[PDB]
Amino acid sequence: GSAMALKVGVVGNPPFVFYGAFTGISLDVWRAVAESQKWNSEYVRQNSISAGITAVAEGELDILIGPISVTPERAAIEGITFTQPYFSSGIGLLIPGTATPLFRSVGDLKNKEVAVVRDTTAVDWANFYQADVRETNNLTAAITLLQKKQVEAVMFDRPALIYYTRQNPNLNLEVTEIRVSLEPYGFVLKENSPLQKTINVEMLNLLYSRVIAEFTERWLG
Ligand X SMILES: N[C@@H](CCC(=O)O)C(=O)O
Site of interaction with a second copy (CB under 8 A): 70-72, 75-76, 81-82, 84-85, 88, 181, 184, 186, 191-192, 196-197, 200-202, 204-205, 208
| 121 annotated to bind ligand | yes
Q: Residues 147-166 vs ligand X: string with x where CB under 6 A? A: ----------x--x------
Three-state DSSP at 126 gives helix
User: In the bound complex, what is the minimum distance in angstroms from residue 121's beta carbon to ligand X?
Assistant: 4
> Is the CB of residue 11 less than 8 Å from the CB of residue 172?
no
Q: What residue 54 binds from ligand X, a second copy, none (CB within 5 to 8 A, per partner kind)?
A: none
CA 86/CA 32 separation, integer angstroms:
13
User: In the bound complex, what is the minimum distance in angstroms from residue 101's beta carbon to ligand X?
Assistant: 28
* Residues 62-91 contacting ligand X, CB under 6 A: 67-69
| 157 annotated to bind ligand | yes
Exposed/middle/buried for 106, CB within 10 Å: 0-12, 13-18, 19+?
middle
Other Cβ atoms within 10 Å of 83 Cβ, number: 24
| 205 annotated to bind ligand | no
Q: What are the start-end ranges of the H helices in the chain?
A: 25-37, 49-57, 72-75, 121-128, 139-147, 158-167, 196-208, 211-220
Q: What residue 204 binds from a second copy, ligand X, none (CB within 5 to 8 A, per partner kind)?
A: a second copy
User: In the bound complex, what is the minimum distance in angstroms from residue 43's beta carbon to a second copy?
Assistant: 26
Measured from the CB atom, is 121 or 200 closer to ligand X? 121
Instruction: Say whether residue 46 binds ligand X (CB under 6 A).
Output: no
Half-sphere exposure of 33 (CA within 13 A, CB side): 27
Residue-wise DSSP of 175-193: E-S--SEEEEEEEEEETT-
Taking CB under 6 A as the criterion, the residue among 8, 29, 33, 49 binding ligand X is: 49
CA 83/CA 68 separation, integer angstroms:
11
Please choose, from the candidates 91, 132, 95, the residue with its C-alpha nearest in 3D space to the C-alpha of residue 110: 132
Taking CB under 6 A as the criterion, the residue among 41, 46, 83, 121 binding ligand X is: 121
| 101 annotated to bind ligand | no
> In the complex, which residues of this chain contact ligand X (CB under 6 A)?
12-13, 16, 49, 67-69, 120-121, 157, 160
Q: Output the known binding site for L-glutamate.
A: 13, 67, 69, 74, 121, 157
